[PDB]
């Protein structure tokens with residue numbers, strides 16, 4: 544019943560802080576399939592799941608998706624090596640809490656997140672088809688090496704306005720070990736990959752490594768492994784890039800909405 548990324552938790556009686564430790568290894572589940580410059584790196588989406596799982600393990604709430612991520616900061620890349628120990632802390636209350644994700648070196652901080660009670664979903668184009676193989680080739684040429692578990696874009700198009708629209712699926716090798724996820728990281732990453740097909744992205748490659756450094760307004764309305772369509776838009780913000788992605792199910796219901804994904808260009 545133990546979450547494979549968050550691990551097992553205790554509350555420190557001397558300060559009220561909840562603390563978890565998990566043992567990570569490159570052979571754990573699908574982690575080996577997320578590679579940057581030949582090194583196994585923990586994907587940004589995994590930190591989002593860890594923060595949501597931490598809140599869910601701390602507070603009793605009788606809702607399937609009680610939380611949103613107000614802000615998540617990705618401060619330092621994590622190289623997943625044998626014997627890695629991920630240390631998560633949570634402070635706060637059932638309305639708003641602060642999560643910090645570290646590795647045992649002392650400790651190094653990899654991500655911080657503010658988690659809050661979910662805001663409900665409110666009710667208030669000509670295309671050019673693209674080849675998904677070309678997207679993954681562009682990403683690999685930039686040093687972003689998604690293995691089979693992450694190769695979930697199976698159809699792709701871009702609108703005249705430069706918005707990317709993808710048909711998505713969760714590869715079988717990403718499905719084991721997922722029962723405990725609030726937000727399936729591989730699925731969230733697949734949704735983000737759509738940003739690589741926007742006009743802004745292809746103009747930049749027409750390369751440099753583009754990595755997420757901040758998420759704001761991550762909304763989860765259901766089980767995102769039911770997602771079949773992702774729509775992503777990307778704009779320049781000075782030397783950075785800012786995107787927005789929506790993942791919907793086969794009946795058009797939004798499952799995941801990321802209001803801002805801020806990326807650095809290396």
Ligand SMILES: CCCCCCCCC/C=C/C(=O)SCCNC(=O)CCNC(=O)[C@H](O)C(C)(C)COP(=O)(O)OP(=O)(O)OC[C@H]1O[C@@H](n2cnc3c(N)ncnc32)[C@H](O)[C@@H]1OP(=O)(O)O
Nearest residue numbers: 585586587617618619620735736738739744753754755807
């Ligand atoms: C093309 C389309 C493709 C689209 C295709 C997309 C498909 C999905 C691809 C997914 C890829 C990944 O998931 S990659 C894995 C997830 N991403 C990551 O791990 C990125 C982790 N972050 C980083 O490595 C770093 O931020 C890095 C980018 C190298 C910049 O590092 P530096 O510290 O050296 O530079 P910084 O100044 O710190 O970075 C920005 C700010 O970070 C913070 N920082 C420093 N100390 C801080 C502090 N004490 N408290 C808060 N923040 C602090 C401050 O906010 C900084 O300003 P100051 O306060 O003054 O310091």
